[PDB]
Structure 1
């Protein structure tokens, strides 16, 4: 059950407890690796003046096997 969900402590959303568009994320793009069998997706913070980036790895059947997050946010919620 944990593997299916809650596998990664660091997630884009917390307890889905969002007041309303608290965080703005924009899909960086999509890239296929080793054929359509393996694919990768890049995500970056929509908010300007932000170097925070997020990378998600998905393979046949979607699902995430590896999540990478780099950068810090000075605005936890919308201003």
Structure 2
């Protein structure tokens, strides 16, 4: 259902942008008590017809990876 994706990214790209075939609207960004890097919160470009939610944050275990986390599935292709 809610999948997870680890993406190698240079540590200078601090945008937390993960290209994944969809476009997204950013609705927040917060630091969490276990990772001193920010977590970005997105929703699908097809919201609210689409329920997919998105989180991107740099892995605390491997700083060379971003972690992208999704919730739900789309109803489109674009």
Task: Tell me the TM-score normalized by structure 2.
Answer: 0.54
Deviation above 3 Å: which 4+ runs of structure 1?
none
1:13 aligns with 2:12: no
Distance 1:62 1:39 in 2: 15
Structure 1 residue runs of 5 or longer lacking an equivalent are 6-10, 15-22
Is residue 70 from structure 1 mapped to residue 67 from structure 2 by the alignment? no
> Which ranges of structure 2 fall in alignment gaps of 5 or more residues?
1-6, 10-17
Q: Which has the higher strand share?
A: 2
How far off is 1:39 after superposition?
Answer: 1.4
Q: Of the two structures, which has the highest relative contact order with CA contacts closer than 8 Å and spacing of 6 or more?
A: 2
**Displacement after TM superposition at 1:74 (Å):** 1.4
Structure number with larger C-alpha Rg: 1
Q: Does 2:26 align with 1:27? A: yes
- TM-score norm. by structure 1 comes to 0.53
